[PDB]
Design a protein around this ligand. Structure first.
Ligand SMILES: *SCc1ccccc1
Length: 259
């Protein structure tokens, strides 16, 4: 019984200031503490960080605050032959190096209905946006940018939710940047340009103009941050998959290796 670790982000990547280290196993880990002790993270400049498990197969490590731009990170997952509990052994090691890019923080403020992109503190874009309508609102919180798609079909049935049901949907969109595993995206919405900056019309996604969505796709990278503030929604879950920063540091740091 072997289990293979997979580390994100990829070796040689540049990622945003929000990117956690992720170590994800292809089997449930019975002894989380054993996995944690086998994983060594080196930072330059050196920063404290801590492990927190999103579920039984994936642990994350990050610092208290967003990474400092230019930080170099080395991840040594020394799991080959290590007993991860219930007679499961690590199949191999993984060794990954990556670097933190520029500080890119985009804030969507429902009081202004503008998505402002700041690069190292400077506004580079101000994008009118239309967010989730009151019945399906966009959650407030900190979102980590994930994958991007030039065109993607978003079908609720991907999440076990029938399309012709209350929480259902089926649409195709261009220039989509993923910001939660729950299915929140920044994307092109030419049909809501009138409403962008004025009225929330979406199902939760951040609708922007075709040009702004393409800009986002081209220039915002994995690990950059989107913050949503002042909506009528709740808070993005800490264990979403891209919601890691919504867990306060004191809780994160304490971890969940015994849970
Ligand atoms: S963008 C569609 C969507 C539905 C539910 C939750 C989040 C996003």
């Amino acid at each position: 019984h072997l289990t293979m670790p997979y580390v994100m982000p990829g070796d040689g990547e540049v990622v945003g200031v929000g990117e956690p280290v992720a170590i994800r196993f292809d089997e449930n880990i019975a002894d989380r503490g054993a996995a944690e002790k086998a994983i060594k993270i080196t930072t330059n400049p050196p920063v404290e960080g801590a492990f927190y498990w999103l579920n039984n197969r994936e642990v994350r490590w990050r610092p208290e605050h967003f990474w400092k731009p230019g930080t170099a990170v080395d991840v040594a997952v020394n799991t080959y032959g290590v007993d991860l509990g219930e007679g499961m052994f690590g199949e191999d090691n993984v060794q990954t190096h990556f670097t933190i890019g520029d500080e890119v923080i985009a804030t969507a403020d429902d009081n202004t209905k503008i998505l402002t992109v700041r690069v190292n503190g400077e506004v580079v874009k101000s994008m009118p946006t239309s967010m989730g309508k009151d019945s399906t609102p966009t959650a407030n919180g900190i979102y980590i940018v994930g994958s991007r798609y030039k065109h993607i079909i978003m079908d609720s049935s991907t999440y076990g939710v029938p399309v012709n049901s209350p929480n259902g949907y089926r649409t195709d969109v261009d220039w989509a940047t993923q910001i939660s595993y729950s299915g929140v995206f920044v994307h092109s919405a030419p049909w809501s340009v009138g409403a962008q900056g004025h009225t929330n019309t979406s199902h939760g996604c951040l609708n922007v103009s075709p040009s702004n969505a393409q800009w986002f796709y081209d220039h915002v990278k994995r690990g950059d941050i989107v913050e949503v503030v002042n909506t009528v929604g709740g808070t993005l879950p800490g264990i979403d998959g891209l919601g890691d920063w919504n867990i306060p540091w004191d809780q994160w740091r304490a971890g969940n290796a015994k849970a």
